[PDB]
Design a protein around this ligand. Structure first.
Ligand code: HEM
Ligand code: HEM
Ligand code: HEM
Ligand code: HEM
Lengths: 138, 145, 137, 143
């Protein structure tokens, strides 16, 4: 449901992420788990310590999903249908936790892209992550 | 909150913060990213665009004062309730700001610290600052409970 | 909304029948009493029980929900003017939509206890959340 | 709450059938907010609204939840103390996000409305909103 302006800012920012998307996904998860320990209980099968290969590999998966989303902003429900079922039906992820990951992602992106993470880009990315979150909790 | 050792580490980081810069940025980003918050700032003049918000001298001056209150909190981390009691009265009894927004501004401040400090704002340090901004938001909301 | 949710919403709103304006006013009154922060959006109203302004405004709210019920496949379009008003002019805090939505559910449950099943409750919740999303976009 | 508001909620609470109301409230939470079912895997059949509402373990648990509200209703100026142990349990052991405490309190209010009709006035309901906000806040305190 993003505006044209928001779509533009999201595609531009995600372009700047480029080949670091997996790295940023992994850092976002790490920041989520450290700042918001309630989220750790969704990953009992993971070692969640710094530098865990499971967190690293999961970050690459999350990055691939966000890249797919960026490439299909006009049909997120379709593009993310399998992931929506997984998160909402199988995992029963509490909607609040999408806010916590989204914040963690913004912190990570701001850290790495300080010139590109303008107020407008921050606002657009916030709405993007909220839209992804809505789809994955439907 | 925090142990004495943990307080030393967050104090050391906080010493680096330029409150004028960071405060103005945090308040401006709140107004841009969460535009309903502009309801409370009609007297600040031009908030019509993102650039107007960020460059508005009243927004920058107010943000500095907001960050000075965080600096006061950083010196009284074991008594945030008392430290923020007057500000709780202002925000809750006088302005009726919904307390969800206190959490939003705290999280914007964390994003701004990340943007301004890069590598130095580590996951560990950020997690302790999450505890601090949660405590500030909780203290500010106290007059609603 | 899903087709099943749309069915439940249209059926429930049918059961409301001629009482919609009354229930809109009651929902506002319940919002203002329960959640006093919301009163600061209406300093121009007499907010006392049975006031003409609350009655009139409740009828407007109800008429917008009726419009929504009649245009469930295009809420963004149907509510465009109301979205601009709430988000751009009035700068209504998104939290307050949750408070009015809850107040509306309490009102509907009060008056339609036989019809307000768990499934209907869930569908009405999603409807009001969808309306709220549109009005805050 | 004021003394008048406490008297009003105390009087109303006496009329409430807590077993029935508690089971309805918990069942509605699970139906309306289905992610909450994550916490109740051991309760058996939650597959449909009817299965949830008729599930004996949901009804039994709901009664226990409402027994804790009954305790709170006697300690409205010390909800923090009253709910301290349950806060530890829900926050530190079960890792329930505190937003859900507000959701269950609001479902309880909807259930009271459904069950009491014109008796559950705007004023009385507003008093119960103060109660459920207090309970949710107390339960979140270990965060
Ligand atoms: C932007 C939001 C999110 C995206 C894009 C996302 C993406 C993904 C992807 C791509 C997978 C892998 C699916 C597969 O292997 O088939 C996954 C799995 C998972 N996600 Fe998420 N996710 C998001 C939010 C969350 C949140 C908020 C939580 C919980 C706090 C969560 C918990 C999980 C869990 C527990 C798994 C399964 C882990 C495993 O099998 O090893 N996700 N997610
Ligand atoms: C952690 C959260 C917050 C802190 C620490 C904080 C701090 C402050 C401080 C220190 C002042 C007084 C500045 C002075 O000396 O004049 C103030 C005023 C104010 N704050 Fe906040 N604030 C917070 C959140 C918010 C939020 C979320 C809003 C609105 C959405 C808000 C709206 C205002 C307004 C309207 C004033 C008065 C402005 C005026 O003089 O016209 N505050 N705040
Ligand atoms: C389901 C949600 C809502 C609906 C359907 C709704 C509907 C309406 C309608 C139909 C009007 C009149 C528009 C006009 O005159 O052109 C209106 C005005 C207004 N609404 Fe809402 N509204 C909703 C939520 C809210 C909330 C949550 C608040 C604040 C707590 C709010 C505050 C106002 C105010 C301040 C006005 C203008 C009052 C006036 O004209 O005197 N609305 N709303
Ligand atoms: C007003 C809010 C709440 C109150 C007053 C409350 C109260 C209680 C009480 C009294 C118990 C213990 C029952 C006993 O004596 O065995 C309990 C257990 C539990 N509560 Fe809550 N609760 C609340 C909200 C929630 C929410 C929102 C969830 C999850 C979404 C939750 C999940 C649980 C679980 C999983 C148990 C243990 C179930 C088991 O033993 O298998 N509670 N709660």
């Amino acid at each position: 449901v993003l505006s044209a302006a928001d779509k533009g800012n999201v595609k531009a920012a995600w372009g700047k992420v480029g080949g670091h998307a997996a790295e940023y996904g992994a850092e976002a998860l790490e920041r989520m788990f450290l700042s918001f320990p309630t989220t750790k209980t969704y990953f009992p099968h993971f070692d969640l310590s710094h530098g865990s290969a499971q967190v690293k590999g999961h970050g690459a998966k999350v990055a691939a999903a966000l890249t797919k989303a960026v490439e299909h902003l006009d049909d997120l429900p379709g593009a993310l249908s399998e992931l929506s079922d997984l998160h909402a039906h199988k995992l029963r992820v509490d909607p609040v936790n999408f806010k916590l990951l989204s914040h963690s992602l913004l912190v990570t992106l701001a850290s790495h892209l300080p010139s590109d993470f303008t107020p407008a880009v921050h606002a657009s990315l916030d709405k993007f992550l909220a839209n992804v979150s809505t789809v994955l909790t439907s | 909150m925090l142990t004495a050792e943990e307080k030393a580490a967050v104090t050391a980081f906080w010493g680096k913060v330029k409150v004028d810069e960071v405060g103005g940025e945090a308040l401006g980003r709140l107004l841009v990213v969460y535009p309903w918050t502009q309801r409370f700032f009609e007297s600040f003049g031009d908030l019509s665009t993102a650039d107007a918000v960020m460059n508005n001298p009243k927004v920058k001056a107010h943000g500095k004062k907001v960050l000075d209150s965080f600096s006061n909190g950083m010196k009284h981390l074991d008594d945030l309730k008392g430290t923020f009691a007057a500000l709780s009265e202002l925000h809750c009894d006088k302005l009726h700001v919904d307390p969800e927004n206190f959490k939003l501004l705290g999280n914007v401040l964390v994003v701004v610290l990340a943007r301004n400090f890069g590598k130095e704002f580590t996951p560990v340090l950020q997690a302790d600052f999450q505890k601090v901004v949660a405590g500030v938001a909780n203290a500010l909301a106290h007059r609603y409970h």
